[PDB]
Amino acid sequence: GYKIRNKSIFWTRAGWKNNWHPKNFNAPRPSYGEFTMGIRCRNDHHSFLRYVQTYRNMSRHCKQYFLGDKQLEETFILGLRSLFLVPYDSQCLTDQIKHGGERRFVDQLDRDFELISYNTHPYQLFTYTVRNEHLAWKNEQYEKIQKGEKTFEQELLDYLDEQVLAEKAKLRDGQNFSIERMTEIALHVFRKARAGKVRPAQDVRGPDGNVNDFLEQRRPFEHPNPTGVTH
Amino acid sequence: ELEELTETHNYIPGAKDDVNLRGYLATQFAWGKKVISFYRHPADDFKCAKATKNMLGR
Amino acid sequence: QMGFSSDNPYNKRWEYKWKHSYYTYPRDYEHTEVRKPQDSKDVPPIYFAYYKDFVDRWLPGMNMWWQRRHRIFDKFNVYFLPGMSLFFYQFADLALGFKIMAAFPLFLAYTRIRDKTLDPDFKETYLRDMIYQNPEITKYFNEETIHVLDYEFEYLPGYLCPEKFPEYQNKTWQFFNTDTAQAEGFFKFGDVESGATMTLKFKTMPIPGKFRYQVGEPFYFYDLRAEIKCDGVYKEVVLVDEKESLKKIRPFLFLI
Amino acid sequence: SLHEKMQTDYLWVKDHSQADSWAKARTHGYNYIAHTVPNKKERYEMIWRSMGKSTDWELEKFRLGKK
Amino acid sequence: TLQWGSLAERPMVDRVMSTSTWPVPYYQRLFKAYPIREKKDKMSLLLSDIDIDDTNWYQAKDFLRGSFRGRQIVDYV
Amino acid sequence: PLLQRFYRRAAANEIFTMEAFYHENIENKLRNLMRITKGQLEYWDIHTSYGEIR
Amino acid sequence: LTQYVEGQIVNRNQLTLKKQEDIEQYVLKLVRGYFRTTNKQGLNINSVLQDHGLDEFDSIELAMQVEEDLGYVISAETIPVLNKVKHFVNYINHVEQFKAENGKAPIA
Amino acid sequence: MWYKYFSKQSWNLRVWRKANLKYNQDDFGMTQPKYIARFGDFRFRLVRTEGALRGCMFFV
Amino acid sequence: MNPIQKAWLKILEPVSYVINEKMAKRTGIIGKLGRFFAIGPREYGVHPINRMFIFMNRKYMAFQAVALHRYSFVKSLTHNGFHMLRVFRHFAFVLPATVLAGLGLFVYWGDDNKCYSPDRFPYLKKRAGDMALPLNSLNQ
Amino acid sequence: ILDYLFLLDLNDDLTRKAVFEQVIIFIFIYCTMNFLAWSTVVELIWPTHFFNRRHSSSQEFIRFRTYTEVLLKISAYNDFFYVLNNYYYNQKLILK
Amino acid sequence: KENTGSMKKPMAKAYEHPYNSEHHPLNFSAVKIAETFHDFIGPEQVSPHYESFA
Amino acid sequence: SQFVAFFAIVFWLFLFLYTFFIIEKHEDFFSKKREERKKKLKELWNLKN
Amino acid sequence: NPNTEENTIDSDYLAASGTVEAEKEITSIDDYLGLVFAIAYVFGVFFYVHGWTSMLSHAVLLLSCYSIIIMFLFILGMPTLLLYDFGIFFLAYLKGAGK
Amino acid sequence: PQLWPNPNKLRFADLYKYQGVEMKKINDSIKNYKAAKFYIG
């Protein structure tokens, strides 16, 4: 499609794609004991254990509001690890960061836990909303199954199993029913099904170039005055 | 994620993005071409200071 | 004993060392188990951030001064500096120079109280490097498998026996100090691989080094003993013996 | 190969003898820009393409050079 | 071109119609109308080019455990 | 010239194009991930025929 | 002393092992219960957790679960050394022996 | 295993009370002169450092 | 739709019956007039002033959260929490104080709300019919 | 009752300083100015975030899943996604 | 055997935050400000005419 | 000219003379984790991601 | 659309160009960013940035007259707090060892 | 689906009990007005 044409896009004064130690005039320089009288520094060697305790708190303090949902605790754990594995797998050389990446990430995670302790972190609220929307749909299926009724998801699974038999019952010259064929059969069913639903307009433009919004009503004028409520 | 950057006051654009491509496009012709360091917070200050036998910490 | 301690249950020996980046303090202390939404209090009360900074930063800081108040009750802090502050306070209205000479001995008293009430912090990295050099300890202990069960380290009160340490029988040094600046403690260690345990008892004192007026090491282990205990073997290691260490170096006797 | 073959070829990239004496546009179009025409965005693309040919698409030379 | 006409007729030159209908409405739509902030049944488009990870086998078990043959596969693996 | 403001237009005009070509750029990234996925599914097509081969 | 379990409140129970054989059976049940653990039957006393799909962060979740079941208060300085099944067993003994002699729990 | 990840290159200094104990005060500064008398010796003996002395005499 | 619109409906319930059922369809002009003054859901009934407040309330509040969420000047004095060198720590409580002062933006708007206006010259002009007076009128 | 409450007076402030009535004008302007400056800084991080999360990926590197992408995949999948997974499973893993 | 499959009763609901709503979101972003801004300026005033008003 | 000289001296130079950053580090556990983490992902890289 | 509206383009890239200079390591950008806004109405008078404040008071340069004082006081305190950060050794940080 | 309200083909009683997105916002605002009774009081 389109690729960045500038070959020097990732160049910095410090090197190629360097976002760990940008070049600045006041660069780090060494210190010599025999000549150093006093010093004021905030660096220390406590980040490793603070990285550990921070993980335990963020996990244990967020589980307070999961109500024993084991599947959510396990899903949240996978998401929590993705937040702590950022420095271990990033392109950025987190080991060469300016003034210590270890202290930087730890202090950054602490600001997240502060919000987690109050149950105000956006990832928490995002989790509650996403889960409630999920359980409502699983309960809708349960109520339909207890009534002996068939779910919309099973009607497709059953409608797709038969469509495969019809295709392989005529596919006798060959006998390699690829995953590609299996896929485009389902998509042909999904498009037909989705179009059947009364969904809000998602694409800007319909079959014509014109937009599918309620505002795309141009001339000619054929609508009369609006009518009132009926008694 | 945008709320997370705001509530943690990580309002330096592209600090938590491993490849701040938007940051390279804006600095293509900048003086002192540089991008923000990874996970840089606008409040952290790692400045130090020392006193030596010479003046100005030298 | 750790002076700076809050109601937080975890990481007691690191509470004063760890510098958190929090804007305010967490709503609840670190949980020891998963709790219920009703176990905590949503939307904490008004003026809660100011309350936490008092019970988590101010109060444990004053408990430290009160725990180690026996180290600041010297004639220099109690009589000299206050008396020097009052002599010039009677003339504070005559000029600004008296206000300064009346407040300086008070800022000086705070500095000595501040430094003397802090928990005694030795260079633990020098210690672990010392024990991991001994083959009798590395036979059962390794940094990747060692864990701390208990830690105690506190100053020794009052002047010591005036035969082992005749240095502290100095009326000039006593005028500035009421304690010795020495510390004694132990370390309960365990190894998750060998299952071994040992009690690393040690005594420390400040010593002079390589210079005339400045101290060399405020916490020098002149006695370092380890009573190692394993499945069925009991060993006693002596890394530093006091009978042989006190013949070569003597304490420093801090002034001011 | 054929791509690099013609790039290196002097004949394919060679100014005519009188090219030096000709009137030369010494701008890429960034000095006076059309801001309100419907092809506005198309104009910027031609400026970007002209700046790139001058530097072999290594725009660091433009950043370092004189404007 | 840079000479498109008068200022009053400027909003006229933007429309490009896909049909031969006359007269043609001049207004060229800028955005899509979004009156109601509806939660889209559509799945998020961020899930686009993410390499294989732990979420793939965790979700496979959840779907396999929905079948009798799948419960055997998971427990044995 | 003081081209600072122009540099901000050139980058925005370039991003305008990258957004217009989002579908193509992403579809090409998946064409390689699908290649990797299709390659791993070849091991299952071989095992399903072992019972018939035997 | 109560916790939610699938939306229902349940009273939590604390365990007292005080026996080497019961400790090995507990840790194995603990590790096998973790959803990230592989080769649950190939797990033994001398099994490295890295060989079963566990990292440093998974050793924390395991310790966090030990505090739930046994009532321990484990410090962050002790967690990063728990990298084997044998390590969880010896740590549990060191805690029980420490409380039997010193009359108090280890420093947290 | 925090000592495993501790870098010994921080041992270049021995910081205590905002002062490096590995400072050759015998060769540089107000403390280098060894011809100092009873008063000057007792003065440095109290403070141990010229930096703290100069700072206090600044306000005095 | 809002409660005030529903209140109008219960009061105009019989009026709606006369316009929409009888007049809106009788014939001729009485129809055009009844279909023009029909009663129902308001076409373009949104209130931009309400929306203007909702937008400006949200935008100004996002600014309050930034200005009020600052690191403490008091905690940075000890050099023991998160701040060793902060040469502009004395600017920490300027924006918070500036936002809290914004609560008096409307309480103290104009000169009359900052003092006792009858002791000021502009009050005399208002009582004289918004008429220009010599500057020394408060003395004579 | 104390005299400290006299500071609440503005009827007779012209007898002491007459300065409050003018300084708060600046404070209202200073707040307004910062509201426009800070709101622009903190709000305008979204274009960069919206772009990078959608165009910064490359095929020569691994794109790692975030927290949100984990929850959305496991706890926010739609019906067609559930059908397609089981449709593939039943056909190939069960029915071959 | 597969036809015999049944379903387990899932949880009734997750945690409901008592201080977060769709119209009064607890946390801040330019997304909600944009939603309120467009409610204020209203929808794009599309002209249905063949010629511009001026 | 005086505008630049003001900020280049009051802030940029003033702080370059009286403040600095240390080159010595106290903790280097990211370097060794990235190596071990890269061996855990050795197979996925073999697939060229 | 942040890629077609030049108003958000100018403000977005301008702010990004200002915050990226935190790598110059002056001090916390979260602290001194507010002073930059005040200093802008001191030297921005040359560019008429104070125009929108002409009806807000009887003095068009009111905000500029206060900002120059603000700019002076807080810059006067920057060295004072820096010495407070050095401690009692602050004289050694300046001159070094005595003679 | 087809029972969805239409502003033209609407009954009087139905409009009185519509309770659309506009009211849903107001009910959220009212939830805050009530919860602020002690703070304001």
Ligand SMILES: CCCCCCCCCCCCCCCCCC(=O)OC[C@H](COP(=O)([O-])OCC(O)COP(=O)([O-])OC[C@@H](COC(=O)CCCCCCCCCCCCCCCCC)OC(=O)CCCCCCCCCCCCCCCCC)OC(=O)CCCCCCCCCCCCCCCCC
């Ligand atoms: C007149 C107006 C008065 C108004 C009074 C107002 C009220 C005042 C009250 C308040 C007083 C201020 C408070 C001070 C204390 C505050 C704390 C403090 O600051 O620290 C102390 C502070 C420490 O001093 P320092 O500089 O840090 O020490 C230097 C080294 O560190 C030291 O190094 P060191 O210790 O290793 O050894 C030092 C010395 C070794 O010293 C020793 O070892 C000697 C020790 C002897 C001890 C004696 C013991 C006595 C015991 C008591 C007696 C026995 C008991 C018997 C009892 C009997 C009972 C009846 O070695 C040397 O060789 C030194 C260099 C040689 C001397 C240089 C002198 C230069 C003077 C130039 C002027 C010359 C004038 C000559 C003509 C004068 C004729 C009038 O003391 C001072 O600052 C002293 C004042 C300095 C001011 C100088 C500016 C004035 C210049 C001189 C005057 C010039 C003349 C001007 C007019 C002339 C008109 C004719």
Ligand SMILES: CCCCCCCCCCCCCCCCCC(=O)OC[C@H](COP(=O)([O-])OCC(O)COP(=O)([O-])OC[C@@H](COC(=O)CCCCCCCCCCCCCCCCC)OC(=O)CCCCCCCCCCCCCCCCC)OC(=O)CCCCCCCCCCCCCCCCC
């Ligand atoms: C009796 C009733 C029953 C009571 C019993 C119940 C008791 C329960 C109490 C419950 C809670 C009480 C709350 C307080 C306890 C807090 C404890 C705690 O741990 O909190 C830590 C807490 C933790 O920090 P955070 O939670 O992260 O954030 C806290 C704040 O949000 C923001 O934190 P921040 O640190 O960022 O805020 C800094 C701000 C804090 O705001 C203030 O405190 C205002 C400070 C104004 C005084 C500054 C003194 C300067 C030194 C002058 C030395 C002479 C003094 C002479 C005084 C004579 C007075 C006439 O101060 C500044 O702005 C620093 C810059 C100062 C201006 C720069 C220039 C300074 C030099 C100017 C010299 C001019 C001289 C010219 C001529 C000289 C010629 C000699 O920090 C606090 O300090 C909390 C303070 C909360 C506000 C309290 C005040 C509320 C307003 C009440 C109305 C005014 C009445 C008091 C007026 C006092 C005199 C003006």
Ligand SMILES: CCCCCCCCCCCCCCCCCC(=O)OC[C@H](COP(=O)([O-])OCC(O)COP(=O)([O-])OC[C@@H](COC(=O)CCCCCCCCCCCCCCCCC)OC(=O)CCCCCCCCCCCCCCCCC)OC(=O)CCCCCCCCCCCCCCCCC
């Ligand atoms: C006692 C009896 C008194 C009351 C009697 C009652 C009746 C009173 C009259 C009320 C009239 C209401 C209905 C007409 C209103 C709109 C008229 C109009 O031309 O707008 C159509 C025009 C586009 O309509 P279109 O043909 O469908 O094209 C659509 C395209 O999207 C457009 O974009 P495009 O780029 O694609 O196409 C080109 C675009 C070209 O136009 C534009 O794109 C922008 C035009 C410049 C906008 C003005 C910028 C001014 C900056 C603010 C400074 C003044 C603020 C006012 C308050 C200051 C303090 C007093 O539009 C055009 O096609 C040609 C433009 C025609 C002239 C435009 C300028 C008209 C004056 C607007 C400002 C009036 C205030 C200043 C006048 C002096 C005040 C004493 O829209 C605008 O011009 C919007 C600007 C705001 C218009 C409303 C402003 C208030 C009413 C203005 C009445 C104008 C006559 C009086 C002033 C003229 C003095 C020289």
Ligand SMILES: CCCCCCCCCCCCCCCCCC(=O)OC[C@H](COP(=O)([O-])OCC(O)COP(=O)([O-])OC[C@@H](COC(=O)CCCCCCCCCCCCCCCCC)OC(=O)CCCCCCCCCCCCCCCCC)OC(=O)CCCCCCCCCCCCCCCCC
């Ligand atoms: C209109 C006025 C305009 C002027 C405006 C100026 C405003 C300035 C505002 C700046 C902020 C000031 C606030 C100070 C906060 C202090 C807080 C505190 O106490 O913490 C302690 C803190 C020290 O802690 P550290 O350094 O972090 O660590 C200490 C070490 O651990 C310690 O290590 P070590 O244990 O080895 O050291 C030993 C010992 C050594 O100490 C000694 O040197 C010993 C001295 C001799 C003592 C006497 C010995 C007597 C011996 C008697 C022997 C008897 C023998 C008997 C024998 C017995 C016979 C039986 O050192 C100490 O412990 C003492 C250090 C603390 C001294 C604090 C002095 C403060 C004096 C301030 C007085 C005036 C305050 C007025 C405030 C007014 C506010 C409204 O003090 C400081 O940091 C001082 C920094 C202040 C620098 C400010 C510089 C600002 C510029 C000022 C002049 C600018 C002129 C240019 C003007 C241009 C226009 C703008």
Ligand SMILES: CCCCCCCCCCCCCCCCCC(=O)OC[C@H](COP(=O)([O-])OCC[N+](C)(C)C)OC(=O)CCCCCCCCCCCCCCCCC
């Ligand atoms: C518009 C309304 C609001 C306006 C608000 C103000 C917005 C300001 C926009 C950002 C301005 C940023 C200026 C940074 C200049 C840095 C240039 C550089 O990197 O040097 C590279 C230069 C040049 O390298 P170069 O590679 O980047 O550029 C090369 C230039 N050519 C092409 C010509 C060769 O080299 C250096 O490193 C020299 C560094 C000198 C730095 C002197 C500037 C110091 C001023 C900044 C400190 C100000 C702090 C103020 C805090 C106040 C608090 C109260």
Ligand SMILES: CCCCCCCCCCCCCCCCCC(=O)OC[C@H](COP(=O)([O-])OCC[N+](C)(C)C)OC(=O)CCCCCCCCCCCCCCCCC
């Ligand atoms: C005679 C009239 C009295 C004049 C008024 C004097 C007011 C004195 C009290 C207010 C000022 C207190 C000092 C504030 C500045 C220090 C901030 C701070 O708290 O830091 C704590 C710090 C905490 O250390 P930190 O803040 O550096 O952080 C520690 C490390 N981290 C961050 C990792 C946790 O500790 C101390 O500073 C030591 C204790 C300070 C002592 C302060 C004085 C208290 C006085 C108590 C009086 C008791 C008797 C009278 C009252 C009886 C009550 C009924």
Ligand SMILES: COC1=C(OC)C(=O)C(C/C=C(\C)CC/C=C(\C)CC/C=C(\C)CC/C=C(\C)CC/C=C(\C)CC/C=C(/C)CC/C=C(\C)CCC=C(C)C)=C(C)C1=O
């Ligand atoms: C607290 O923190 C802060 C915020 O929160 C985050 C902010 O949003 C903000 C920003 C503030 C805003 C965006 C609001 C700005 C408002 C401004 C500028 C003024 C608004 C003016 C109007 C809307 C016009 C009003 C006109 C009038 C009142 C004149 C006519 C009188 C009318 C309409 C009311 C009649 C008068 C009465 C006394 C009767 C009252 C009637 C009632 C109470 C009936 C109510 C009926 C129902 C059904 C509720 C700030 C400054 C802040 O500090």
Ligand SMILES: Nc1ncnc2c1ncn2[C@@H]1O[C@H](COP(=O)(O)OP(=O)(O)OP(=O)(O)O)[C@@H](O)[C@H]1O
């Ligand atoms: N080599 C150094 N270089 C620069 N700053 C240092 C250095 N060493 C210490 N500092 C600063 O002085 C502080 C105190 O150092 P200190 O050795 O007492 O810490 P520590 O945690 O007790 O070490 P240990 O675990 O070995 O006992 C440190 O927190 C640091 O800010």
Ligand SMILES: [Mg+2]
């Ligand atoms: Mg120590």
